[model samples]
Target: MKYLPQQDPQVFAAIEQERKRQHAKIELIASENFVSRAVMEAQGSVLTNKYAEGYPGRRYAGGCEYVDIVEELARERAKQLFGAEHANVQPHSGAQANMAVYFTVLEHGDTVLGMNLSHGGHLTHGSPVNFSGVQYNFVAYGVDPETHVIDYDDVREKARLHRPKLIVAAASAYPRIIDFAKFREIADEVGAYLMVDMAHIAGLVAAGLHPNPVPYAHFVTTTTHKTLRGPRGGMILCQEQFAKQIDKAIFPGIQGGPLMHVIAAKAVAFGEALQDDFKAYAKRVVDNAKRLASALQNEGFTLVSGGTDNHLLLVDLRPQQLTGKTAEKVLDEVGITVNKNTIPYDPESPFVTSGIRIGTAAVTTRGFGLEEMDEIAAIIGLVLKNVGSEQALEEARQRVAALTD
Candidate 1:
């Protein structure tokens, strides 16, 4: 902080502004969480100056003894947290983690079945513009129209029809628990690999609140920074058989060098996640989500799937006759950070969707509880119900300041 402020005043000023903004706003974005100071310290450590290109004990670069230990700790901790036989902590982002899995299991133009993007799936789960979709023939399975839950029958039907090489079983905006066993069953029937992207609910899984995907999936990919509450990075957990292929796919296949500092942060975060207190924290995250969903419903907002089984929920804003875009804009104007997300069978475009995704992870990390959740619901109601009123927005802003302060 000292050298940056002295050497680069402009950059430091913007970072300072960001710090202020983070402290000021209510971060309800589903994919975000606050990492611990230890995690931040590890990420900012001298490990960043090292270039550990390959796996521990067999690095492509020399002088990797210390970084090798760091990477090994990260890998061991990740495996312990997820109960996987092998873990790869090299991928820089969740997208790359996923890409590596695909590279290992699939050939070009091979059919793959994934969740529908408009129905709560991530871009890495085969969006047409992404590499997953462009390189591979990606088909989609959507949620049921009425219940808004993933249709297992539809998944089976698609797998049988396509005979895909892989079946992807998790989501980014989904508010319900995915049935990974069913996904695996379908994948087995189709002789396809099963990959579960537990990015959004990694912490819940680690805390034993959500079902662990490592057992049922051939590969599991997650971001360390979500519910896991680590620095921004990605990891892949798999059975022992595919460990070497996954590592190779990540290294000489896709990326050049690994981020050892981020791996150090992942190790620290994994260590934290293995504790009992983190279990309680994750429990609070889910409890707060349910509370917030109920509060939002009481304020006349429709929630996708009627509620959530984890840390996030999707508010179907159509009941209020509002677009997610408008709601996001107004909420941000009042200092609440959220993202416009697509709900199941959304009538709006992805750019201007019909729902907003809200999560309790960051707020729960900040020590907010059920009562604060009610207050947040009320403020959102005030801002959206009276979007034209400057008085209402100002009032909401003040309430937000009270909570954050």
Candidate 2:
């Protein structure tokens, strides 16, 4: 960053600050992780200078031969990781990957069924503020209120009634194993195409820790940055039969040019995920989550679904006097970062929900283990259980400093 400081002091300072904060904080955000230095170098490589406006060998721009190698390697490795018939590594984001799929299959005003945003679905699924809800009609289904688990029977009932052209089986906050086969059956019963956005759990899926959605869904989309721990980008995988349409949709359909540098970074990250150590890392992620869950539950903080089966867990704070927003703010001040989320059948408004979602992916990447998660859960439980006191906050901060240091 010697040249960076010479060019822009403010930007360099901000980047430095971010680096320090990441090093000094305990990151529990479900969708965040730290990449290796190899992935960083791949992103900062000189491949960003050239413009590759199309897929390999079919680009509309010159000087793309090398970039073609980078992209092809990314796509190929992704195919190997998930056992997909085809892989597209060009969408700049997971949302764009989803958009490209929608453009490929659904006509404007076509009906689609997705999980409810308030209940754990991504905004791209059906929230009216997003392009998905604006361009197409998207109905929603949710988890069972009692068990806080998705009921396949309810999904089938919704499918029978709505008869949507597409059924999206995905989530942004769900912490249990998603049954893709049942989702496929519901889609088949309704004669609708199935799409699974496994962005949050891509690492687990690749490590075979979670159920693979590739063999069930007609189309699958993911962000390489999440649990996959790659560059911040998106990917699409599908059957060979829909290969052309998916490719065309990504190239001229939605995005203009591929980020060759980020794609290269993705290849590096994908390579890392295939190793035996990476599989152990993913297993540790889940192990740490369960560890944290047990500790928090012991401290009297209610888990949304009684516990978690994956990397993330939602804590319902209604028993305590803390709103989700307040808990998020309080935890951030103590350097334990997490995001407020709504639990299933939450009564509070979205702005001030009843839960905070925590994950172990980032900390696990930082080499934290079961012992670290136990300490973290203890700190979180203490602060949230006593929100209006500064002395307690200071004690929590001290404990956090001991961990980060």
Candidate 3:
């Protein structure tokens, strides 16, 4: 918070207003969460002052003894949380962690297989416009058009044909659990190293609500925020054989000095995740998501993949005769936060997607449950049923406000 100057009263006021907005709104974004106060305190700690340029005992700076302890604890917690043999808590974001993995494992122009971006895959997972595609030859796999879920057969067929040097199993908008073991088998068949981007499901994985990818993947990357509820940072986990290369790639190969403060915050979050309460929290997130999905389905809204097994679902707005842009604006005006996203094989452009991605992570963090999901579903149904109608917008706003307070 000190990064911003105090003289700017307007800026400070805006920040406060946003904070209030978050507290008063139903936050359904899958990739967002509320961090604990302790995690926040660690992020704003004195560790930010030290410029620890290297890992633990191998620091380039002189006053890194204390900083090293924080980093080491973060690494240990991460390893324990994911069952990873080696861990690096330095990458600035999930994108950075992914880039480090690519740099460490593949040479320029090497073939890499990943999910298609429009079909729930992340940008760093090989979007042609992204650096990963620019530097490497990207081959894409997508969910089955009929099932609206990832097809292992298709992935295997692509891998067999492409013979990619790297295979990435991940998603940004997917609603189902990924089978890391199947991916591992595909990677083995192609002689490609597997990397699972568990950023979207880190909390579920940590709480044993989902399968851990560490056992199957050569490298694993995730964002610290999302379901993890930590600061905005990234982590890398890998088998022991890839330790030195990954560490070097994250440091001199990509980033400079690590953000020790965020690393400390991550350590705090990982500690929280180790508790039994965290498992209940994770299970609630999934339950809440299922309730929301079912509510929407009962109201005649089409859910991609039929339903969800995790904390998010994709609603195909075409059935409601709405576009993603219109749904996003209409929902925002009513204090409900969700994102416009593309459905598998969508005909609309990315900017005007045909689907709206909804989740329960943030709302679940705010203590919302099945009852709230029912109300939320009703609100969304009415909003979509009467899109662009000012009267409907005002009514939805009142309903949302009543639910918030």
Candidate 4:
């Protein structure tokens, strides 16, 4: 019963093929990671059958004694792992976590400030197409054009000008570490609540490789799969004063029954993150990223922000006389996986982006180090150089396979 043996054979075959594809390809996607076997086991646990509709010690249904304990352990582990005053482990994904926080804190038509979507920020950070923009009046701030770094002065100016009820500080494709304390000071100055969406760097924050936002932001949200290496799920951490509101927002306002199985996997991930070995792994992630960034720059590629402080970097492809879509497709054909991304001040459309993002987390999890990253950068350069040449693309694919072996 662990798998669907009676399911369609074609579907099962496709799943196996996709698994093999992942096992063979070098994954450079910033938002992806390989989970531990134990985490997978927890995801398939019988806890999936339970309908845990409420928090522990206050369930709405019967037969919840064991599930209540599981939920409590997940919550406690998350709180301890991040030094959070309270933790909610029930959001289905990162966007849902943001939605719940916005629902809890802001009324419809209330003004808010966040990073712009095309400028390394997430869709939930008020892209005008998302609900966050439709329901609330959203103002955005971006990085400086000259340095490709966040302009805190501009953020302060926007907050002073708009006087929004909430301000969100976070990014999806940024390469530098954010100053959460400064964001907190701005929020305090404007009497606005601050929320940080640390979806991309949760593991770095947990391992102390990056600054933790739990103490500085009013609420922090993240997805467990990226960097954290858990199953696909979301979590929220907040101060004790906002705990009840956050919890209620997640339950009645957004979701109903929590995925207890994913919660169990999250508990396992948190436990792994607490170990000393995990800290070493995190350091390696940053080191590998720096190596990759330097290699790319040395090979005549333009890197956004000049380099990275964490596991990922965005490559500006314009200087290479190639489009982001061209770079992504050519590299993917050569057994490397990356996504076309909009640069901080993008001049191209989102579909035909000006940059491509690459990360070291998945490869680092697969036991790759600085040497591997050096080779990866070289492969990327070669692939981009011969974007339309089928012969060169095939040769590069073979080379990537040899590296994996």
Candidate 5:
């Protein structure tokens, strides 16, 4: 912080502005979290100067002795946290982690079954604009129209019909628990390898709040951030037999040198995740989410799945007759940040979806509990219900200032 201001005033000014913004606004984006000072210090450490291209002692460069320890700690900690036989902590992002898994098991143009994008699946799962959709022949499994939960029957039907080489389980905006056992059964029946993108709920799984996918999945990919409260990075966990293929896919197949500092930060975060307090924090995150969902419902907002079992929930705005875009903008105006999202069977386009996604991870990290959750939901209700009233928005802004202050 000292050198940045003296060396580069412009960049420092912008960074300071962002820091203020983060403190002032309520971050409700499902994928975002505030990492601890230890994680930040590691990310800003001298390790960034190193060039450790390969894993541990098997590096492509010399003078990697210390970095080897950092990388090994990250890998072993990840494996221990997920109870997996092996873990590759080098993928730069969640999308990269997923791509490496695909490269390890799938051939070009091979069929893959994943959740529908509009139904909660991430773009990397198979959006036509992404590389996954371009390279693989991707099919979709959707949720039940009425229940808004993944329809296992539809998943089985898709697996049987497509005979996919891989079957993807898990989603970005889903609020309920994914049944990995059923996915494993269907994948086995169709002779497909099962991979889970548990990026959103990695912390919940670690805390034993959600079922661990490592036992059932052939490959598990996750972001070290999100509910994990780590630096921005990704990891892949797999059985011992496929470890080498997964590692090679990430190294020679997709990326080159690893970000040593981020890896170090990831290790620190994993260490924090192993502690008892982290379990309590993760429990509060889910508890706040459930409380927030109930409060939003009481405020006349309908949640996508009625409630949440994890850290995030999607508010279906159709009942309120508001587009996600408008809701997001209104919330932002009141110093509350959220992202527009698509609900199951949404009649609107992704760009102008009929829902907003909210989460409790960041706020919970800031020590906001059930009482604050009710206040947040009330502020949201005030802003959204009075979108056309600047007086109401100004009042909501003042309320937000009170909460953030």
Candidate 6:
């Protein structure tokens, strides 16, 4: 950082300001978390200097023995953590990791089944702007209107009609547990490859709080950062039979070089996930989410699907006549950060949705429990309801500073 400060003062100042802001605000973004300083140390190491163009022992360049050790540790630990037969610790981000899977099995114009993005899915699943949509014929499945949860019967009907080459059973904003076994049954009946993106709930899966999709799906991908509290990168797990194909698809099929430093940080985070305390933290994340959801409901807010069963909750703000955009802005002003999300069958546009998505991962990482969650629940309800008053906003901001400080 000494060289960085000397070379670029402006960027260093921005980094410092961001650090101070992180400490000051309450980050409830479902996709965000605070990684340990140990993880940061590994991310900033000298492994970034390497140019290893392939997996361990098969790199296209020399001077890779040490990088090989780093990657092998990441791969082996990932397999052990997820109980998978094989692991790919490359694919820089989750989108690329997913694309690698598409490259491994899908051909151009093949049919695929994925969750609806507006309902709770990631864009990489099938959004038209993404490569997955343009490259393949992706059909979207959604939650039931009444229950606002996955309609397995609907998925069955979709599979029967489409007979897709791949069925993707995963989500980014879903709040309940996914039944990978059910997804498997559908995939088996339709004769399709089942891929589950466990990116959002990898930590819960690793700690056994959520159902493990690895044993049920043909290919499972996750980002090491979200909920898993690692570096910002992705990994893939598959059965031993698809090992070579998945590996080739990642190295030369899509990406060129892997980030050895982030892979090293992934290994470090995986090691942390293996400990007893990490399991306890996962439990607390779930607990805090449930408590917060309940509190928000008692404050007269409607929760999508009635409540949450995981680390995040999608709150429909229509009861207060609030738009997701307005809620996000008001909350940000009060130092509580969250993202606007679309609910099932949302009548509004994506830019001005009817709901906001909140999670307990980051605040729980900051050591918040049911007590602090109760405070947050109160804080959010107060500010969003009193948006007309600078006095109320200031009062809410003070309470947040009291908690964060």
- Where model 5 places Cα greater than 4 Å from the true spot, the runs are none
Question: What is the overall TM-score of model 6 with all chains considered together?
Answer: 0.99
The list of candidate 3 runs beyond 4 A from truth reads 1-7
State candidate 4's TM-score.
0.98
Q: Give me the displacement of residue 178 in model 6, in angstroms.
A: 0.5
lDDT of 3 by residue, 1-405 (tens): 665647787898898889898888888888999999999999988888889998999988898888888899999988888889999999999999999999998999999999999999999988788999999999998899988889999899999999999999989999999999999999999899999999999999999988999999999999999998889999999999999999999989999999989999999999999889999999999999999999999889999999999999999988777889989988998888999999998999999999999988888888888999999999998888887788998999889998888
Taking the tens digit of each residue's C-alpha lDDT, what string does model 5 give over 164-242?
A: 9999999999999999999999999999999999999999999999999999999999999999999998999999999
Candidate 4 per-residue lDDT over residues 80-174, each given as its tens digit = 78999999999999999999999999999999999978888898988788999899999998899977888999899999999999999988899
Global lDDT of model 2: 0.93
User: How high a TM-score does candidate 5 get?
Assistant: 0.99
Q: What C-alpha lDDT values do all the predictions have? A: 0.94, 0.93, 0.92, 0.91, 0.95, 0.93
Number of backbone-clashing residue pairs for each candidate, in the order shown: 0, 0, 0, 0, 0, 0
Model 1 Cα lDDT, one tens digit per residue, 1-405: 778999999999999999999898999998898888999999999998998888999988899999898889999998889999999999899999999999999999999999999998899999899999999999999999989999999999999999999999899999999998889989999899999999999999999989998999999999998999999989999999998999899989999888989999999999999999999999999999999999999998899999999999999999889999999999999999999998999999999999999999999999999999999999999999999999999999999999999
Query: For candidate 3, what is the lDDT?
Result: 0.92
User: Which candidate has the top score in lDDT?
Assistant: 5
- Model 4 ranges off by over 4 Å: 1-3
State how far residue 132 of model 3 sits from its true place (Å): 0.6
